[PDB]
Design a binder for this molecule. Structure first.
Ligand code: PRO
Ligand code: PRO
Ligand SMILES: [Sr+2]
Ligand SMILES: [Sr+2]
Ligand SMILES: [Sr+2]
Ligand SMILES: [Sr+2]
Ligand SMILES: [Sr+2]
Ligand SMILES: [Sr+2]
Ligand SMILES: [Zn+2]
Ligand SMILES: [Zn+2]
Lengths: 483, 484
């Protein structure tokens, strides 16, 4: 690893993801290979989120990836803000197809015709379906592994309800699960808020989101989305149910949709990584503890003690690997598993082995702890938990010191250009948000809105005006440069 | 269910997969929706197979779905066979791309360029990667859900080895796992064999496969394949490693690939499905036991009735018997009886007021329909024994139908006659591609194709035996018959 994070973040990020064996590059621009080390992190996210939504009654399924040309021309609002982001398949080999079919940028147009057929009575509600699949979102920006990719893995849940009350409560419930994925699994603090009318999901009623901050570049990034679609989609696809008491009365269902992608892994890398490579939170680390024989007569004695620790950690269900390979130097193994971000390195040397003790090296801080043999299960469990909270507390210390309030325009400008995100009084108008992005690049890149936070840092002053100095302010809005 | 299995099988198949809430149709032909009832079966197959390949050192990953045209044409024999069924992306919205890119029909040409970068030394081998993903093969033949789809889910494992012995060993290991999936999980007997030169994976060395038989249609179907690719792909993508003992020497890696698709669910539906609907083998049954309260006057005693269903729901979970208590008060019990019958739940547990007073209940088997009156005492043990008896009964019934419609034929006179009986035949075959085309041509005057060259044939081919054509010597018994 040659590049430094605080200097050239782009070169550092490329070396960290590749030398840790997370990502390989593909011949198709914007497409990246998810190697096992990174795929296991997605599986840890998948295992947590799947078990949580099944408590809410959500069931897993799989819908086709192709969208017909007629189905996309259904909702006029959903097709406009998505057509340039859709790749079309027009031929099979040397034979043109009947009609050009589209690769899914999202599965609203695929599932909701089926929802209309499944929903006829009030007993058929609520429908709660989820799928883990890939999605092709063609775009024109600069692709980045995990962060901005033309193909990415995600889950997308789509729920239909008989009332808007229950639909509104699922939006926040799923958004809170997304917050737990970032805060409790990846040790990343997020800000929960609402998207502005300019950046909300097209055709939906409102979009909620979680925003994470990357202090290495001073830019924020959207971590997830939970949309309330209202009856907009159910009216165009005719998702209607019969009234359970009023004979013959039919009502359009209230729908939601929510997604979480593999950019979680990229935000984990950007926030926690250092100049020695990746840093994995123990909650999602494929290997939490790596056992390395040091000082490698009684050679079989040292190897069997490594196997004793390996099985003792498996009994308390700690993900452990014993690198017993004789082809590489111990110092080589030290650097190999540090680049890969293993939270704890367990070193067993001949002297320590005969003393019934070992050395545990913390990946986050580099601290070396000498631990006795009998305390291996309890101590290593305590260090792993201490690593998880340390990563979260240090990440939140960056968020608290890089998100502040500004009530005028150029103080919002002055704080922004120092690598921060700012909450400002905003009128919420779309034409005003265009001027903000143009002025932020005028007086780099132009700052766009991130979210209208639920719990802002400060409450709005009575009668406070927007930063544009032309319309009254509706709410504090978190602005800043974004990926 | 409208149609019946013995009559219009295609109509029966559509009814059973939709009324069981497995498949919903899409407005694009060949593409189908995997509803949660069908997806749970795929998840059960995934959990078994994934754990088995982890023991062999295989690791999960995910490669991109797009293929460049330069990488696709790196192996000429491989691209020549998949070319007509490759879906090509040619436009981004309303703008035509300068160079079109392809949707993967398979991931050999996607992964092996990455294998070349990862393999430099002998320590880099073996590589054993697997991915659970979707794939697109645009077959213009009349599609059918699960059996013949344009897009389907599968797993594909790709392994590279330093030697041929270990590579050849993995081929038979993965093949036996595919056999376990059909026989142990889905209760479907299969025949292990090698595909002919005409039907093997183009570009590979040899293809092993498992062939199942559908007695309702008399046709056989390929249930999965495990290919030995040899060095044909490593030579084209330059997957080379330095010799561990000879300085400067490099050798090409020996590669394998193996895939199992959602066709498994279709075969399970075709083999075990009856006129009452789907029939799930208890090994992959999302719900093995469904509790339905039946007998609805006294609201005070009905309160203890739902408590009895929850009582059975709780203690059945102690032995981890997947049990669901259908306690919905917005549907008739008779509606729930036929609803869970269509879905194929192996056992229906009916709770009645009189049965509660007599300290008894009634268990209904899905495969046989035998309504058996059991007691509260042996509720956990006998429902466990009935589940295992259902799995064996389904497998025995499908094995007897296979052992009945798979016979040996030493003459085209016998081969075409027993082919009209809705059967499959093992005949002495020379293995020539031109002869396999002649066999397919003369059996339509509905043409029969080659299925597999069985490892354990019905009879042994002794020297002096000629092929069914008569122009060349026969080298092995080959299972023929009409296929999907
Ligand atoms: O694309 C989106 O943002 C929503 C959420 C997942 C499904 N559609
Ligand atoms: O398509 C096939 O049949 C082989 C096996 C899985 C990957 N490629
Ligand atoms: Sr549900
Ligand atoms: Sr009305
Ligand atoms: Sr109404
Ligand atoms: Sr491995
Ligand atoms: Sr040589
Ligand atoms: Sr050589
Ligand atoms: Zn304004
Ligand atoms: Zn012949």
């Amino acid at each position: 690893l040659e590049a430094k994070k605080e200097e050239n973040l782009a070169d550092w990020y490329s070396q960290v993801i590749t030398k840790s064996e997370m990502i390989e590059y593909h011949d198709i621009s914007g497409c990246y290979i998810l190697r096992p080390w990174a795929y296991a992190i997605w599986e840890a996210i998948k295992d947590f989120f799947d078990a949580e939504i099944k408590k809410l009654g959500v069931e897993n399924c799989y819908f086709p990836m192709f969208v017909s040309q007629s189905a996309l021309e259904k909702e006029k609002t959903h097709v406009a803000d998505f057509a340039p982001e859709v790749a079309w398949v027009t031929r099979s080999g040397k034979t043109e197809l009947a009609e050009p079919i589209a690769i899914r940028p999202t599965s609203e147009t695929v599932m909701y015709p089926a929802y209309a057929k499944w929903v006829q009575s009030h007993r058929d509600l609520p429908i709660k379906l989820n799928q883990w699949c890939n999605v092709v979102r063609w775009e024109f920006k600069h692709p980045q592994p995990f962060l901005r990719t033309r193909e990415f893995l995600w889950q997308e849940g789509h729920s239909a309800f008989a009332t808007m009350e229950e639909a509104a409560e699922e939006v926040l419930q799923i958004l809170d699960l997304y917050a737990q994925v970032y805060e409790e699994l990846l040790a990343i603090p997020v800000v929960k808020g609402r998207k502005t009318e300019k950046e909300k999901f097209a055709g939906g009623d409102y979009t909620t989101t979680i925003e994470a901050f990357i202090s290495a570049s001073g830019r924020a990034i959207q971590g997830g989305t939970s949309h309330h679609l209202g009856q907009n989609f159910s009216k165009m696809f005719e998702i209607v149910f019969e009234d359970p008491k009023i004979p013959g009365e039919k009502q359009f269902a209230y729908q939601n949709s929510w997604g979480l992608t593999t950019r979680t892994i990229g935000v984990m890398t950007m926030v926690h990584g250092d100049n020695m490579g990746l840093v994995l939170p123990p909650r999602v680390a494929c290997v939490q503890v790596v056992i390395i024989p040091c000082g490698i007569e009684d050679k079989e004695a040292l190897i069997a003690k490594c196997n004793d620790y390996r099985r003792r950690l498996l009994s308390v269900n700690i993900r452990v690997r014993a690198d017993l390979r004789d082809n590489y130097s111990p110092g080589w193994k030290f650097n190999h598993w540090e680049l890969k971000g293993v939270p704890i390195r367990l070193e067993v040397g001949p002297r320590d082995m005969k003393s019934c003790q070992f050395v545990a090296v913390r990946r986050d801080t580099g601290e070396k702890l000498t631990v006795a043999e009998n305390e291996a299960e309890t101590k290593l469990q305590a260090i792993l938990e201490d690593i998880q909270v340390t990563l979260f507390t240090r990440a939140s210390e960056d968020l608290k010191t890089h998100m502040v309030v500004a009530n005028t325009m150029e103080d919002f400008q002055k704080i922004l250009d120092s690598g921060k995100i700012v909450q400002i009084p905003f009128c919420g108008e779309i034409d005003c948000e265009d001027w903000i992005k143009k002025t932020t690049a005028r007086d780099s890149m132009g700052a766009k809105s991130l979210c209208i936070p639920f719990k802002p840092l400060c409450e709005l002053q009575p009668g406070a005006k927007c930063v544009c100095g032309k319309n009254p302010a509706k709410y504090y809005t978190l602005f800043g440069r974004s990926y």
